[PDB]
């Protein structure tokens, strides 16, 4: 019942 | 788009620009908008009537943006302050379905080839700026990294009243015009 | 103008065949540029220009990150085409045939709008035989509200009698639907 | 250009350290990398490459991407160690071999007792030159002469014994050729002789 | 580790060709790479989830393929000579990988004729009782002459054993024509013992050298054998 995403990492 | 497959998704369209500064949140599935999170209100936003039946944290969204902020900082700082380049948009307008004088229908205006992402459409009717019954999507993303976005004027087409659509843009030297009439 | 700096992170999922195929391609872009890269197939960051070489390689070098994004095309791309197969990939929505004659009468267009999925196939036939040369279509028309368009033009000479039929194949459509117009005179 | 080796072939004694350098013109590349392929054979990895210094037996590769240089040392080279040593370099949808640096490492004869023997064949008038026991610093010249061969120099190592030797080999069919005459082109004034 | 088959071929100019290379156990990737003297390693093709991933820049008559069990195979539709080379693939877990796992070769010979194929005729020379006197050790010296290609592989027997202890072969044969191209070889080899080993009348010296010449298919008109792969062998026992 819910769509998964992808995280964004930092850079540092 | 040179990878070939049967479908194509993005989960999700991350986008963060200096210029606001802005960002947006959007999945897509085969090139259409699933939804957009609303970051200033923190609100999922379905454009899809069948997808209203799922639940997407916004907070999800807003961290990730975040990061974005984040590292867009960083690259600034690398890139020795390399800027966007404006690419000179195309605008198109067409009707949803054929034209029947009285009858229902709905102008739709695409503008393709947008970058950066700032862009202004707005609907004229002989010069007066038309409000009422206007929506648009979000920033739908290309593979090429520019981007699209379709503006729509619910209308009754009528023998004597023509249609602008007028769309502002840095890769532009003037607002462009694209007229239609039935 | 207005300067603008603009980051752009894309986690995309690619499927053929079902879920026979599925890759995953996370994307990070500052401008139009791509500079980094994570694509399943590879199993790790790739820097696609010097200005993603730090970020790949840091990335890269931990441990948790790399397992974590390894496991994302089964985590991601599969949870949510588990979703897709419920909604976006069942939805049906029946084209909308229209023929209308033009100029430059010596033109049809058939008018196949409000359909989905993009999958269609339009043919013109006159007399029942299948048009070929003097058809002009434009390409698929993408409205943005989950529904597609497409006008496939037919030059034609038309003869007293004769029949024009438009016949479109849709994905939601047990048989596929022909829209006729007969010519009334000669042209 | 993409991937620059030392050229020439590096002749060092067993014992010496090797250093084995590399230049690659693409900032953007991303991983590195040294094979090792011996002749006519397939190559192998050898080791990864990293600017902290990766550091396996006698063997240590580093990167320096401010000069863009790759570098390999192999401490206390032995025998073994001949090869030739591939710098691998990998940017963006694109892996380069490098064309290798060839090295070939000499024993160090201790006490060297050169000669040239004369070898009978065991099933029936045909016969070989055996020059063998010399010294490592000692070259041997292919013949001019369409009659008469003379293979390039070669170590054995008779391990259980811990001794090795140099000895090369000529032959002829032709009946005027002599031992004493085989090995004139390539000689030592020690030289046995019997 | 990584198999490849035939591991030696010798085809004439025109002749079709597919090699096959079957990757480590679990590995998705598969590259061929072309080795000739000169070059180096030249870049063919990548193999990944049973389609193309990569390519290099050879002509159209260098084809590739990958099955489901990751098994590749190379094909060149019309061989040209200098198609000769050492054709190596390599396989990795995953696409695109550095740390590459490389099959042993095959090494593919193209003439135009061949009439000019020969197996080696192999002697094996006795140790000089000169050395034996004066180092107290045996050297045995084995040639290998008149072979094409150089599709050779030499090895020593003691006793029914192999032995590596004490040999050494020549990295590169000799040509018996050093002008052409399609000229015989010739190969030397040493094995050296201990004289009291030699002395022993009940050691078993042999020679044993692998030659790869023609296949079965293969058409033979001429006179003599037709060279086709064989062992071809000499040996010595020891006197007192
Ligand atoms: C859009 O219109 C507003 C109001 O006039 C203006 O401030 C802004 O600069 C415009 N944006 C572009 C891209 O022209
Ligand atoms: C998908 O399946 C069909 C057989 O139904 C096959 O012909 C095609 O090659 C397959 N595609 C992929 C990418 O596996």
């Known amino acids: 019942a819910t769509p998964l995403l992808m995280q964004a990492l930092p850079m540092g | 788009e040179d ?147 379709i503006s729509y004027l619910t209308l009754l087409p009528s023998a004597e009243e023509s249609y602008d659509c007028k769309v502002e843009h840095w890769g532009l030297d003037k607002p462009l015009l694209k007229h239609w009439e039935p | 103008s207005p300067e603008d700096f603009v980051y752009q992170f894309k986690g995309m999922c690619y499927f053929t065949n079902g879920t026979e195929r599925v890759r995953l391609v996370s994307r990070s872009i500052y401008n139009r540029e791509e500079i980094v890269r994570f694509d399943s197939d590879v199993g790790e960051f790739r820097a696609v220009t010097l200005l993603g070489l730090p970020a790949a390689e840091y990335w890269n070098s931990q441990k948790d990150i790399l397992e974590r994004k390894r496991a994302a095309v089964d985590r991601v791309c599969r949870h949510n085409y588990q979703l897709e197969l419920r909604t976006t990939l069942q939805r049906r929505v029946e084209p909308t ?91 | 250009k993409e991937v620059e080796q030392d050229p020439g072939p590096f002749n060092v004694p067993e014992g010496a350290t090797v250093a084995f350098n590399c230049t690659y013109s693409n900032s953007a590349s991303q991983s590195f990398f040294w094979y090792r392929q011996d002749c006519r054979k397939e190559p192998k990895l050898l080791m990864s490459v990293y600017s902290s210094g990766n550091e396996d037996g006698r063997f240590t590769a580093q990167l320096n991407r401010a000069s863009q240089y790759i570098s390999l040392l192999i401490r ?3 025998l073994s160690d001949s090869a030739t040593y591939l710098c691998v370099v990998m940017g963006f949808q694109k892996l380069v071999f490098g064309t290798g640096t060839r090295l070939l490492v000499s024993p160090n004869i201790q006490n ?30 292919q013949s001019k002469d369409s009659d008469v061969y003379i293979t390039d120099k070669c170590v054995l190592d008779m391990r259980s014994m811990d001794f090795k030797s140099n000895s090369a080999v000529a032959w002829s069919n032709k009946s005027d050729f002599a031992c004493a005459n085989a090995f004139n082109n390539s000689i030592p004034e020690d030289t046995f002789f019997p | 580790g990584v198999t490849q088959t035939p ?82 693939c390599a396989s990795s877990l995953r696409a695109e990988s550095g740390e590459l796992f490389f099959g042993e070769g095959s090494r593919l010979t193209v003439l135009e004729d061949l009439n000019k194929v020969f197996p080696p005729e192999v002697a094996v020379f006795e140790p000089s009782e000169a050395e034996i006197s004066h180092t107290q ?41 050093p002008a052409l191209n399609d000229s015989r070889y010739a190969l030397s080899s040493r094995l050296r013992v201990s004289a009291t080993f030699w002395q022993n009348p009940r050691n078993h010296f042999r020679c044993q050298v692998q030659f790869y010449g023609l296949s079965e298919n293969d058409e033979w008109t001429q006179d003599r054998a037709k060279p086709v792969t064989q062992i071809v062998s000499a040996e010595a026992w020891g006197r007192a």
């Not at chain 3, 008018?111 to 006159?126: C, E, L, M, N």
């Not at chain 5, 096959?20 to 180096?40: A, D, E, L, M, N």
């Open chain 5, 137 to 177: 050790k045996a050297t045995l010296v084995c040639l290998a002459t008149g072979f094409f290609p150089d599709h050779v592989e030499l090895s020593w027997w003691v006793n029914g054993k192999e032995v590596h202890s004490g040999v050494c072969t020549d990295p590169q044969p000799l040509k018996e024509q």
């Open chain 4, 76 to 78: 206390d080279s032995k």
């Open chain 3, 97 to 187: 045939v229209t023929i209308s004659p033009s100029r430059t009468h010596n033109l049809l267009v058939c008018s196949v709008t409000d359909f989905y999925p993009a999958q269609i196939k339009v043919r013109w036939f006159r007399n029942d035989q299948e048009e070929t040369a003097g058809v002009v279509s434009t390409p698929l028309i993408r409205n943005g509200d989950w529904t597609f368009q497409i006008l496939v033009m037919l030059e034609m000479t038309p003869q007293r009698g004769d029949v024009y039929t438009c016949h479109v194949e849709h994905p939601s459509l047990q048989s596929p639907i022909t829209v006729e117009w007969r010519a009334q005179s000669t042209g």
């Open chain 5, 7 to 88: 591991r030696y071929l010798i085809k004439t100019r025109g002749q079709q060709v597919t090699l096959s290379c079957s990757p480590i156990s679990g590995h998705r990737s598969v590259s061929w790479y072309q080795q000739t003297p000169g070059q180096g390693l030249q870049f063919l093709f990548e193999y990944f989830s049973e389609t193309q991933r990569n390519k290099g820049n050879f002509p159209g008559r260098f084809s590739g393929r990958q099955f489901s069990n990751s098994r590749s195979e190379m094909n060149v539709s019309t061989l040209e000579l200098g198609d000769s080379a050492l054709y190596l």
């Open chain 4, 112 to 141: 060297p007792d050169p000669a040239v023997y004369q070898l009978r064949d065991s099933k029936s008038d045909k016969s070989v030159c055996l020059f063998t026991d010399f010294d490592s610093q000692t070259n041997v010249s």
């Open chain 2, 3 to 149: 990878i070939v497959a049967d479908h194509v998704a993005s989960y999700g369209v991350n986008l963060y620009q200096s210029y606001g500064p802005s960002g947006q949140y959007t999945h897509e599935f085969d090139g259409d908008e699933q939804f957009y999170v609303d970051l200033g209100r923190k609100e999922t936003v379905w454009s899809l009537p069948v997808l209203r039946q799922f639940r997407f944290d916004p907070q999800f969204a807003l961290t990730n943006i975040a990061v974005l902020k984040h590292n867009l900082n960083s690259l600034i700082k690398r890139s020795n302050s390399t800027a966007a380049t404006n690419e000179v948009p195309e605008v198109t307008v067409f009707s949803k379905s054929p034209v029947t004088l009285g009858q229902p229908n709905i102008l739709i205006c695409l503008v393709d080839n947008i970058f950066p992402p700032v862009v202004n459409i707005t609907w004229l009717s002989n010069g007066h700026s038309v409000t009422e019954g206007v929506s648009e999507t979000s920033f739908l993303s290309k593979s090429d990294h520019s981007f699209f976005k």
